[PDB]
């Protein structure tokens, strides 16, 4: 603490490369036991961990990714592979280091390790120096005096991992809860064909050669890369209010739902957004406005519930970029009950998913706050 | 197999030239008594050899025993292609300085497969969408990997000298 | 207006084949128009414009000594597009051989051979190149802004853009009112040589814009490129040939500014078949460049042809960095004297037809001694499609830091020679100053954390009321 | 058929023998087997606009979980989370 | 429709010819031309020939 010496990195560090492998049989299905692990998310599906030159990841070294990436680190979790880029960083010394300490102390250098600019490899950079080290406490009580902060950082990283785990748990339980409750409604709950709730609108797009129709303005121009979000308040592009002269767009009210119809689906769940501003959107998506028989959040969450079947309702329509057409999107019939059982049940379901995600009163943004304060308290390490 | 024909500085006219084969390591006295002398000590006429590298006709035998240690230190896939590595390096000592930098693609055989390895297996540029996975140019990316780094192609695989 | 006539060129020439086939025909017709207008404005500068075949051989020797072509008789472009739409084709195939009469002296010629007869049938050829000559005649060019259309038409999609070339020119040109200038190995076009006389008609002419180039079809367009820009004639040449295997001029002379743009790692099997280990230029390096990385052979050839006053400004792909000991000893010989002065990084892509970035070496036999490894990644305005422009008063910041060895952060600075021999002779690591790093405050983050815990837990307990099965 | 169709081994080597025999086998007499396709009505295919081949694409990758296991896991992870957050709050000493 | 393929032996029962760059149903009409009252055709297609 008071006796901190800047020791070089490779003084107590053994660097090596992964051995020879055949880690890829031509089918790598989930039923096998070792996880194929890379950068980003360290989990691809199962492989068999024997008779392939395996390193099998003994008791906690760390790794490097990658050529040209140079940022991602991992603690070897239980016993995993060496998949094609896991060049090993570990320790020669085994009574001072406790190299999860220096794993944490890679986050004492994101300063020079933030700018990966050219085509580049940084072997000598981690190979030489430096790191502040509580030496001259070798090997007596250095782990004992860093035991405080490693208890702190272990429980905080554990907090982050379990918060991601329980966020998965809340989303999983709530996705089952969407399908259990609010469905199969009877009786006799009325049956409404889609679009009869209110006349939905098509789209519209200007040219991009027109500079005066694209450069400035104040209408939110909603593209599907802006989509996938909930409670849309603005857009990336603030397109011109004059640009509606050659847009074929329609001005929509301030309580609408926005929904894409182009190729995010055919595999997965469709996007859906509450849009709060009068906006205009391109050919790549659509907007629906309801009318007079409803609550608008009931249409939103009814489409969100029935997404798993309206991805199927006009599913193929050819194997092209084309998708669910206007017809079988339009010609699906939904339950619409008595009036008091619109705003009651959506008051529960809105209250649940505003607790789940974003942004006001949402859990992963809180997790990001925790990651920010955790990295700041890692900047509150023993530098003193 | 990794041997020489070292005799003799005596008999410049080489009338029934002698001295057949000596593997490594090499004694001075055993070779000297095998080949005789010219009443003094001037020997090791390196006429013929069989080595993975090139050596001159005036090289001392101690330098040969020095080089044999570093040659026999390396694995066989390096020892099979030592001249190919010498086309980029300059000495066996300089090869011994950087003997762990050389990455060996036994699987890959040409630059298309090297690009396909760096993209599909590693994900060096990032994730690969499956609908994109067929529509990725490998030849131009292979040419730019060639012009960026330093790749050498042999019979076994591809040697990559990294920095 | 400029872009009006530029758009006229960009539309009114494109019919009806690949651009790298009618390239030769359109540029040859435009070049024939320039020869016609230049020779007419010479002989008419007193208004006897409509000429006659009475040509004065005792006077018709003097522009053959002066402009190197008594270009015509009543056989110009002005006399040909009015008398166009007539049999036959090869009046101009003779009237290219006749302005190449020109044997005395300093030919710089045998030149219009790219224009040919194909075509499939001869009347189709007549109609097509009559349409070509008429479309070149149908241009509003007047009288001195001629070569701008040539520089636009050579810029096709398929070439060393004008702002990077301006940067290479301005780097090699300051505090130097001297002679001669300027040499170019592997010139390609005459583009990057041309930004001298874009400015340096100011004081005097100095000597000829020298150069050497490999590909003959590019050699022709290069020799007409610096012909159209009203440049004088006698020493203002390019010689055909490879600079490595067939170097000239050794005899003349140590220069005072050189520029280049070598291609990335062209192969050359030279090491070591001739006496290039004991030649005049590769011998001080101690080794030749390796078997497919030609670039430091170009920079050794560059430092060959330079005096005790001038300076070199060349480009490189950034990959020629360490690349083993064969390149490390070339970098060692460069830093061992005070040859190298300043490297410059630029942003990818910045180029027609590549992906990777570049670097710029500035060499001098001129001492301080320290290596300002002045970098740039942004800006470098690479945003507007594709990576244009390094505008004016934008490279002036680059030249401005380059002025006297300054040390400015978020940008690079000088280094120590002992530091760069301590490191293994790199380019260009230092400095890379510390962007995108931001830290927050304790109490704001933790108050936000605790209040969202209160709201989240009251919402979770209200969820637990609403968890009725 | 979408799988199998052994499309795994490079490149899509090979729909083996006794593997197309299932394909020929259902083809024999007009059978109707799920996770796989079946017969349709002529009136249905003139009702639709003459497509190929939408029906059936039977309902894979859909799995539902039981309430009480998920909510007991949720409440136990909240207890662990809250004791660790108050442990953070003691350990939030500036 | 440059020759009499609108009134030929095989494309006339279709009522139209195949369009100007999608030859595939011209192949399947040519296929159903050369088939008796007993046999059966087995041809392949790209899956895009769907509605078009």
Curated annotation (Swiss-Prot), chain A:
Cited InterPro entries: Restrct_endonuc_typeI_TRD, Restrct_endonuc_typeI_TRD_sf, Type-I_RE_S_subunit
Domain of life according to the entry: Bacteria
Region ranges (Conserved region 1): 142-187
Segments for region (Conserved region 2): 338-384
Region of interest called Target-recognition domain 2, as start-end residue ranges on this chain: 188-337
Keyword terms, alphabetized: DNA-binding, Plasmid, Restriction system
One of the GO biological process terms: DNA restriction-modification system
Record carries keyword DNA-binding: yes
Family affiliation: Belongs to the type-I restriction system S methylase family.
Further remarks about this protein from its record: Type I restriction and modification enzymes are complex, multifunctional systems which require ATP, S-adenosyl methionine and Mg(2+) as cofactors and, in addition to their endonucleolytic and methylase activities, are potent DNA-dependent ATPases. The presence or absence of a 4-amino acid repeat changes the sequence specificity; a third copy of TAEL inserted at position 179-180 changes the recognition site from 5'-GAAN(6)RTCG-3' (EcoR124I) to 5'-GAAN(7)RTCG-3' (EcoR124II). The shorter protein is also known as Type I specificity subunit S.EcoR124I.
Role played: The specificity (S) subunit of a type I restriction enzyme; this subunit dictates DNA sequence specificity. The presence or absence of a 4-residue repeat changes the sequence specificity; a third copy of TAEL inserted at position 179-180 changes the recognition site from 5'-GAAN(6)RTCG-3' (for EcoR124I) to 5'-GAAN(7)RTCG-3' (for EcoR124II).
Identification of the protein by name: Type I restriction enzyme EcoR124I/EcoR124II specificity subunit
Organism lineage string: Bacteria, Pseudomonadati, Pseudomonadota, Gammaproteobacteria, Enterobacterales
Gene from which the chain derives: hsdS
From Swiss-Prot, chain E:
Superkingdom of source: Bacteria
Further details from the record: Type I restriction and modification enzymes are complex, multifunctional systems which require ATP, S-adenosyl methionine and Mg(2+) as cofactors and, in addition to their endonucleolytic and methylase activities, are potent DNA-dependent ATPases.
Protein family membership: Belongs to the N(4)/N(6)-methyltransferase family.
Annotated function: The subtype gamma methyltransferase (M) subunit of a type I restriction enzyme. In the presence of the R subunit the complex can also act as an endonuclease, binding to the same target sequence but cutting the DNA some distance from this site. Whether the DNA is cut or modified depends on the methylation state of the target sequence. When the target site is unmodified, the DNA is cut.
Record text about domains: The C-terminus is required for assembly of the restriction enzyme complex. The individual domains assume different positions in the enzyme, allowing the holoenzyme to regulate the methylase, endonuclease and translocation states.
Subunit text: The type I restriction/modification system is composed of three polypeptides R, M and S; the restriction enzyme has stoichiometry R(2)M(2)S(1) while the methyltransferase is M(2)S(1). There is an equilibrium between R(2)M(2)S(1) and R(1)M(2)S(1); the latter is methylation and translocation proficient but restriction deficient. (Microbial infection) Holoenenzyme interacts with Escherichia phage T7 protein Ocr; this interaction leads to the inhibition of the restriction activity, but may still allow methylation and translocation.
Entry protein name: Type I restriction enzyme EcoR124I/EcoR124II methylase subunit
Range covered out of full length: 313 to 364 of 520
């Amino acid at each position: 603490g008071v006796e901190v010496e800047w020791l070089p990195l490779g003084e107590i560090t053994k660097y090596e490369q992964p051995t020879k492998y055949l880690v890829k049989a031509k089918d790598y299905h989930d039923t096998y036991t070792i996880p194929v692990l890379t950068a980003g998310k360290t989990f691809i599906l199962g492989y068999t961990n024997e008779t392939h030159g395996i390193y099998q990841a003994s008791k906690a070294p760390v790794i490097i990714f990658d050529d040209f990436t140079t940022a991602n680190k991992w603690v070897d979790f239980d016993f995993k592979a060496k998949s094609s880029a896991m060049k090993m960083v570990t320790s020669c010394d085994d009574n001072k280091t406790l190299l999860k300490y220096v794993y944490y102390w890679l986050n004492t250098l994101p300063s020079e390790f933030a700018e990966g600019d050219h085509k580049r490899q940084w072997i000598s950079n981690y190979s030489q120096k430096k790191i502040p080290i509580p030496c001259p406490d070798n090997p007596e009580k250095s782990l004992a005096i860093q035991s405080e902060i490693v208890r702190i950082l272990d429980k905080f990283t554990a907090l982050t991992a379990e918060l991601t785990a329980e966020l998965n748990m809340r989303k999983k339980q709530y996705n089952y809860y969407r399908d259990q409750l609010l469905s199969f409604k009877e009786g006799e709950v009325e049956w409404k064909t889609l679009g009869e709730i209110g006349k939905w609108y098509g789209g519209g797009t200007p040219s991009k050669n027109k500079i005066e129709f694209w450069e400035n303005g104040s209408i939110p121009w909603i593209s599907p890369k802006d989509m996938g979000r909930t409670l849309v308040d603005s857009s990336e592009d603030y397109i011109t209010e004059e640009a509606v002269l050659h847009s074929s767009t329609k001005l929509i009210p301030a309580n609408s739902i926005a929904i894409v119809v182009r190729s995010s689906i055919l595999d997965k769940v469709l996007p859906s957004a509450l849009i709060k501003v009068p906006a205009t959107l391109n050919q790549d998506m659509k907007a629906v406005i309801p009318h007079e028989n409803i609550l608008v959040k009931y249409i939103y969450h009814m489409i969100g519930s029935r997404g798993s079947d309206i991805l199927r309702a006009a599913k193929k329509t050819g194997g092209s970029v084309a998708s669910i057409d206007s017809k079988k999107l339009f010609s699906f019939k939904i339950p619409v009950p008595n009036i008091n059982e619109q705003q009651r049940i959506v008051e529960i379901l809105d209250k649940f998913d505003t607790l789940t995600n974003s942004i006001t009163e949402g859990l992963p943004r809180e997790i990001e706050l925790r990651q920010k304060q955790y990295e700041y308290y890692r900047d509150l390490l023993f530098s003193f | 197999d990794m041997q020489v024909y070292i005799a003799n500085l005596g008999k410049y006219n080489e009338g029934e030239l002698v001295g057949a084969w000596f593997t490594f390591p090499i004694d001075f006295e055993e070779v000297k008594e095998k080949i005789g002398l010219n009443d003094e000590y001037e020997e090791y006429a390196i006429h013929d050899y069989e080595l993975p590298f090139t050596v001159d006709e005036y090289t001392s035998i101690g330098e040969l025993n020095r080089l044999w240690e570093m040659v026999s230190e390396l694995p066989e896939e390096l020892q099979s292609e030592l001249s190919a590595l010498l086309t980029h390096f300059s000495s066996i000592e300089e090869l011994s300085e950087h003997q762990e930098d050389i990455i060996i693609h036994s699987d890959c055989d040409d630059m298309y497969d090297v690009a396909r390895y760096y993209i599909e297996e590693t994900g060096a540029l990032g994730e690969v969408p499956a609908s994109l996975q067929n529509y990725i140019d490998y030849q131009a990316y292979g040419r730019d990997l060639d012009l960026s780094g330093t790749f050498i192609s042999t019979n076994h695989g591809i040697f990559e000298i990294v920095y | 207006e400029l872009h009006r006539q530029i758009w006229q060129i960009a539309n009114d020439v494109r019919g009806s084949v690949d651009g790298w086939d009618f390239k030769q025909y359109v540029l040859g017709a435009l070049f024939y128009r320039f020869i016609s207008e230049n020779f007419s404005s010479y002989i008419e500068a007193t208004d006897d414009i409509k000429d006659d075949a009475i040509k004065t051989k005792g006077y018709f020797i003097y522009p053959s000594q002066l402009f190197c072509n008594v270009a015509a008789k009543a056989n110009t472009n002005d006399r040909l597009n009015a008398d166009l739409n007539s049999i036959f084709v090869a009046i101009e195939s003779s009237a290219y051989g006749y302005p190449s009469e020109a044997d005395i002296k300093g030919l710089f010629a045998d030149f219009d051979t790219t224009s040919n007869r194909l075509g499939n049938t001869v009347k189709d050829k007549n109609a097509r190149l009559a349409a070509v000559l008429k479309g070149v005649e149908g241009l509003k060019l007047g009288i001195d802004l001629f070569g701008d259309a040539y520089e636009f038409l050579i810029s096709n999609y398929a070439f060393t853009p004008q702002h990077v070339s301006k940067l290479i020119a301005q780097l090699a040109m300051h505090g130097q009112t001297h002679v001669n200038k300027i040499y170019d190995p592997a010139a390609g076009s005459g583009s990057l040589l041309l930004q001298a006389k874009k400015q340096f008609d100011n004081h005097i002419i100095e000597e000829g814009f020298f150069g050497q180039e490999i590909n003959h079809t590019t050699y022709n367009l290069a020799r007409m490129n610096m012909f159209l820009h009203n440049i004088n004639y006698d020493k203002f040449d390019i010689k055909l040939g490879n600079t490595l295997t067939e170097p000239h001029f050794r005899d003349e002379k140590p220069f005072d500014a050189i520029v280049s743009n070598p291609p990335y790692s062209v192969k050359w099997i030279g090491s070591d078949d001739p006496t290039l280990i004991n030649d005049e230029r590769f011998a001080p390096a101690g080794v030749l460049a390796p078997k497919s990385k030609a670039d430091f052979a170009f920079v050794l050839h560059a430092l060959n042809y330079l005096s005790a006053k001038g300076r070199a400004a060349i480009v490189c792909f950034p990959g020629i960095f360490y690349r083993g000991g064969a390149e490390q000893k070339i970098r060692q010989y460069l830093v061992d004297n005070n040859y190298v002065e300043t490297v410059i990084s630029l942003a990818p892509n910045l180029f027609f037809g590549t992906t990777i970035a570049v670097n710029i070496l500035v060499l001098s036999k001129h001492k301080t001694d320290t290596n300002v490894q002045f970098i740039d990644a942004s800006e470098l305005f690479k945003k507007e499609t594709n990576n244009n422009i390094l505008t004016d008063a934008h490279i002036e910041q680059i030249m401005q830091v380059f002025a006297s060895k300054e040390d400015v952060a978020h940008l690079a600075k000088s280094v120590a020679f002992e530091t760069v021999v301590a490191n293994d002779y790199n380019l260009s690591v230092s400095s890379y100053v510390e962007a995108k790093d931001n830290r927050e405050i304790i109490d704001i983050a933790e108050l936000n954390a605790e209040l969202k815990t209160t709201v989240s837990k009251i919402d979770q307990l209200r969820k637990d009321i609403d968890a009725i099965v």
